[PDB]
Amino acid sequence: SHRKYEAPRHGHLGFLPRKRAASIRARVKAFPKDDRSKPVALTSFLGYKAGMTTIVRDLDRPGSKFHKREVVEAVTVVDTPPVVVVGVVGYVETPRGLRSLTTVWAEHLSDEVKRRFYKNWYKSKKKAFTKYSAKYAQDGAGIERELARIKKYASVVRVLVHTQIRKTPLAQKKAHLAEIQLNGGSISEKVDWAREHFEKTVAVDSVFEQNEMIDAIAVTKGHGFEGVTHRWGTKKLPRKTHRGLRKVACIGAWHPAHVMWSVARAGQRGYHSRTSINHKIYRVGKGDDEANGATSFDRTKKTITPMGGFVHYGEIKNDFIMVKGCIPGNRKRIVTLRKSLYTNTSRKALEEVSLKWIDTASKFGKGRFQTPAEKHAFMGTLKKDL
Amino acid sequence: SGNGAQGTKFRISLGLPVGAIMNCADNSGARNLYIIAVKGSGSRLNRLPAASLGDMVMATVKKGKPELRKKVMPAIVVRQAKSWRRRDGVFLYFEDNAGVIANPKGEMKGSAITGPVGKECADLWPRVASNSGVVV
Amino acid sequence: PEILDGKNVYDFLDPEIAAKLQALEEEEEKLENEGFYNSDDEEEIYDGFEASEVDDIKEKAAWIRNRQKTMIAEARNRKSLKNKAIMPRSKLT
Amino acid sequence: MRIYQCHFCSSPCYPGHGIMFVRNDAKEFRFCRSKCHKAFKQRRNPRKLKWTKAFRKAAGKELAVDSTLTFAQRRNVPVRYNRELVATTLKAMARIEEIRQKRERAFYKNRMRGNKEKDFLRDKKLVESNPELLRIRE
Amino acid sequence: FNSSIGRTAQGKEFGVTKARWPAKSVKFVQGLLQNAAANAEAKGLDATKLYVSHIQVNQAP
RNA sequence: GUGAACAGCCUCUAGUUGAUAGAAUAAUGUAGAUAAGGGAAGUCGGCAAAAUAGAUCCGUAACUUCGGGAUAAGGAUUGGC
RNA sequence: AUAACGAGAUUCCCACUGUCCCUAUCUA
RNA sequence: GCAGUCAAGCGACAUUGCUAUGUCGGCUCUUCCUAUCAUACCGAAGCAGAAUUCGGUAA
RNA sequence: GAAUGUUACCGCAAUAGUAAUUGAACUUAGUACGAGAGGAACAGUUCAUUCGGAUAAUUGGUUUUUGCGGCUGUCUGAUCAGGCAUUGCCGCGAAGCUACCAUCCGCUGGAUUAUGGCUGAACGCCUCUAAGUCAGAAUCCAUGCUAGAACGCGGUGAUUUC
RNA sequence: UGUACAACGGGGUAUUGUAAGCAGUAGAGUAGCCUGUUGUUACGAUCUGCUGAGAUUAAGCCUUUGUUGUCUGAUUUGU
């Protein structure tokens, strides 16, 4: 029986099983080629989604029918405050895959990461690094031995960094530890650069830059138990079918006498880690620079933050990265930014993105003004003024 | 894209599926057009072919001069009447969906076009723009 | 620039901006000196009503409004006449 | 780029916002948000709606005509884009905005003048007609 | 007897994920325990050392 | 009381608070709804839904056993003072 | 030995509409 | 198929005239086969270009 | 989800699945080809069809925010302010949800099928094959992504005087 | 036991649409007294000014130089 018709299978079979992620932090699987001819530099960064906004860009794409035209498009804003190194990991190649040799921590750690090691922190005595700190000092030798061991046997060096959550408007107060592979100079150079950065902070403009292409890796929005109709896009039954109509009716044949794994049963939807690539960065922002949302074609001394703040999010107040399109995960969610992972040479990557105007109207509703000054000028003085 | 198109087609909302009635906009004598199929559309299971502004479709005249009835000829949609995304950043829609009849070569049967003509249709079809007294 | 806080520059961009701006400045000086912006109206006046009397009258009016609102609320809460009749005070102890 | 004035409210319509309508009359109508578009689709008259600038202009709630508003016009004749003229216009726009705000505040004050006397008279009427309440108060 | 019983976070104490709050059974058990404690006190046993060595429940008519 | 009406709804006299319930609003169901453009292109088949619904005035064809069709069809109005 | 009328059987036209394109949302 | 035809072996290839009595069908679903319709890569065809025929692996 | 001395954090990956897909547009170029008719390669560049993963930036859709206003019957003596008419009705309507009805994205190395060969006997020539070997498919294996063996594994901090 | 947390309150941003009440030489028109010919005093749906006024604002919006309150409740874990 050929069923008289051929149709593509509903849903991609590669993204299975559709189960909830084990952690809100989407761990990075693969790092770039790590060519040791370049200077030591980071391979990824941690940021928090801070809603989206619109951008009008004077497209200069040659050959396209939008060449030299003005095109409006969506851009996502991610809060990316500076990151502080708090350790290094030395990895030694083994026949059974890469293995962690040893981990070296910094001289002192902020309460943000100490909190990450406890679940009853307020009840905790806060003994995070009482002895390790004592072991670091009084000889300058114990750590140096670990550094020498890493230099001798390590092959890829990963830097332990965490986000400055206290700087973000989130009430979480807990930082997110992550391992970022070190590219560039030899592993000895990698560890030497990481060692000098102990307890220091790393900005974001030194990793990424305008026109750079990055890959977004984060946990998608959760939706709970979902029917097959929305989980896989199954077509609805005509009407009032017996024992339901919003479900797949036929599950399988008599032979085999078992339900095939690919028949797209209903179950959990969302909250699955996903990876997206080829996302072009439109603007790199700084919290210390006024008029972050300004442009050469706008002249308005206004911040990217929309009037009244973002929806379900506070004010940026820190460095941020502007990226076109949509990024997996909801607002105020930890998202890790990763390089393109390959030597992209498409004209889109080579394109220069010079923003013409940035939308800062309130996202709380049908916003009509970009700044409170415009609203005051339009509406004028009110009763409450006098 | 069929013959007569001088560029790529923008992705716009589907306004007229198969069987949709669109008013005429030329002096050819026809008054309404019945869409039977859409040229350049990739047919898929359960998915009714649908056109949009600037698309070329095959239709049979239902009202107007009887000489044009019962025959199917290519037609170009000049008005969509369904909101579509313009790259200028405006969600614009037309009062009434309308189309014009033309040969596969793109030559307009009518000497002139009446009423507004969509930008995405005039730009893609030089003959429509030349025979259209109004754009947007 | 092509844009400002509002009312795009291309609407204002015209030859001889300086002359019109100077004319507007002259118009503004023809009003500031004349007292057009009479923002110094910090005190009112009536038929001999002193500050103490007017302040007392305003305070009494505000108190009367508050008392009337409180009485309205009390009547609305206590009446409940839409469902049943109120008890007779004569028979109550 | 071009900020458009709402047909129903005259509010600034930034790019990528609202809906535009094109009629067989070959003219375009722009609405900032869905509210104004729906109101227009009902054939309502903005001059009769209190929440649109048309009524305020007709009702005189705000200064309808002023010398500052003459600067803003549809420049059908372009300019040669002189660098000095750009800076002069940049300063002039801010100065004109400040002057217009001052004039609007003055107009609002002139419109609202006299409310103090009415409030005082109302307070006097309330006080005079409520002797028992005052007696119980003290 | 835990077939198709709902899950509760309070079961981590005893490991078993399935647990419930049988208020009536708990009331009867505590009443019986109070009666046993009263009997022990009348006998002369030390309440501090008292522990429930044996407890048996079986179906009734 | 509204309303032509004992049509539908509220209220007075009179009579009841009896249907195991606490928390959440996952999928799927039961009952009732809304939806941009096309308007049956779906289906064995206009299955279900929808559309007109009262009153005043104009007007009302073929057939016919002249009694009916007929509220044919199709049109204009409905509030308050 | 053919008028009216029909919870009679079938065909077609206007309005119409989530049957469908293509599904989405809400209430108990 | 009928009736011939000659002949390497013990009759192959070639060769002569004409010549419905049953109920299965459709909406959704997953998977598998190639005896490849389309897409990738090639050879032969009067392939000058364009277009087209066949053939080989490839699901 | 018990047992892995306890808890917690960061990691490797045995293994299973796997995806992208197809046509158009500029230049090549009215150029090679061609008497004329007509009419192409490659490389570079730009979109779209189907499918898949995300997300509300903008717009569409929902109203129990019963959020704000108006409408009818009825009731509280009238105004105000309110109850019922199974969510009373009508207009708008944020937050939420969602739509090619709205937006973004969907990588590149090795080995191979047929095929072209190189050397080279078998056969004192010849040969693409017997040895070896150069390439060559949307193919296979890989890069990447999905889950992580609950009895696969590594590193690190704390490890209960009372 | 402190950029600690929670309930309110103040602002920003939004939704709707001009609240009660007051006064009017606006108000089709109809009535007492009077004696006009803008008489006056009464009813009068609506309209006008306070009044882009009034109301809600997170239950999954942003902020908080303020007010009030909270900060030792049980169990288990050992190479």
UniProtKB/Swiss-Prot annotation, chain A:
Keyword vocabulary terms for this entry: Cytoplasm, Isopeptide bond, Methylation, Phosphoprotein, Ribonucleoprotein, Ribosomal protein, Ubl conjugation
Cellular compartments per GO CC: cytoplasm; cytosol; cytosolic large ribosomal subunit
Residues annotated with Phosphoserine modification: 23, 155, 296
Locations listed in the record: Cytoplasm
Glycyl lysine isopeptide (Lys-Gly) (interchain with G-Cter in ubiquitin) cross-link site: 38, 135
Residue positions, PTM Phosphothreonine: 102
Description of post-translational modifications: Methylation at His-242 by HPM1 is required for proper 60S subunit assembly and promotes translational elongation fidelity.
Additional notes on this entry: Present with 450 molecules/cell in log phase SD medium.
Protein name, UniProt field: Large ribosomal subunit protein uL3
Organism annotation: Saccharomyces cerevisiae (strain ATCC 204508 / S288c) (Baker's yeast)
Swiss-Prot record, chain B:
GO-annotated molecular function: large ribosomal subunit rRNA binding; structural constituent of ribosome
Keywords, in A-Z order: Acetylation, Cytoplasm, Methylation, Ribonucleoprotein, Ribosomal protein
PROSITE patterns: RIBOSOMAL_L14
Pfam families the record matches: Ribosomal_L14
GO cellular component, one term: cytosol
Residues recorded as bearing N6,N6-dimethyllysine in the entry: 105, 109
A single BP term in Gene Ontology: cytoplasmic translation
Post-translational modification: Methylated by RKM1 at 2 different sites, but it is unclear which are the 2 methylated residues among Lys-39, Lys-105 and/or Lys-109.
Name recorded for this polypeptide: Large ribosomal subunit protein uL14A
Organism whose genome encodes this protein: Saccharomyces cerevisiae (strain ATCC 204508 / S288c) (Baker's yeast)
Gene it is expressed from: RPL23A
From Swiss-Prot, chain D:
UniProt keyword annotations, A-Z: Cytoplasm, Nucleus, Phosphoprotein, Ribosome biogenesis
GO annotations of cellular component type: cytoplasm; nucleolus; preribosome, large subunit precursor
Listed GO biological process terms: assembly of large subunit precursor of preribosome; positive regulation of ATP-dependent activity; ribosomal large subunit biogenesis
Claim: Protein biosynthesis is one of the keywords in the record: no
One MF annotation (Gene Ontology) recorded for this entry: structural constituent of ribosome
Subcellular location, record wording: Cytoplasm; Nucleus
Quaternary context: Associated with nucleolar and cytoplasmic pre-60S particles. At the end of biogenesis it dissociates from cytoplasmic pre-60S particles and is likely to be exchanged for its ribosomal homolog, RPL24. Interacts (via C-terminus) with AFG2 (hexameric form); the interaction is direct, recruits AFG2 to pre-60S ribosomal particles and promotes AFG2 ATPase activity and RLP24 release from pre-60S ribosomal particles. Interacts with NOG1; the interaction is direct.
Function, as annotated: Involved in the biogenesis of the 60S ribosomal subunit. Ensures the docking of NOG1 to pre-60S ribosomal particles. Activates and recruits ATPase AFG2 to cytoplasmic pre-60S ribosomal particles.
Family (UniProt): Belongs to the eukaryotic ribosomal protein eL24 family.
Descriptive protein name: Ribosome biogenesis protein RLP24
Organism name: Saccharomyces cerevisiae (strain ATCC 204508 / S288c) (Baker's yeast)
Lineage per the UniProt record: Eukaryota, Fungi, Dikarya, Ascomycota, Saccharomycotina
UniProtKB/Swiss-Prot annotation, chain E:
Shown stretch of the complete protein: 63 to 123 of 184
Anything else known: There are 2 genes for uL22 in yeast.
Family the entry assigns: Belongs to the universal ribosomal protein uL22 family.
Modified residues (Phosphothreonine): 8
Subunit structure: Component of the large ribosomal subunit (LSU). Mature yeast ribosomes consist of a small (40S) and a large (60S) subunit. The 40S small subunit contains 1 molecule of ribosomal RNA (18S rRNA) and 33 different proteins (encoded by 57 genes). The large 60S subunit contains 3 rRNA molecules (25S, 5.8S and 5S rRNA) and 46 different proteins (encoded by 81 genes). uL22 is associated with the polypeptide exit tunnel.
Compartments, as annotated in UniProt: Cytoplasm
The name this protein goes by in its record: Large ribosomal subunit protein uL22A
Primary role: Component of the ribosome, a large ribonucleoprotein complex responsible for the synthesis of proteins in the cell. The small ribosomal subunit (SSU) binds messenger RNAs (mRNAs) and translates the encoded message by selecting cognate aminoacyl-transfer RNA (tRNA) molecules. The large subunit (LSU) contains the ribosomal catalytic site termed the peptidyl transferase center (PTC), which catalyzes the formation of peptide bonds, thereby polymerizing the amino acids delivered by tRNAs into a polypeptide chain.
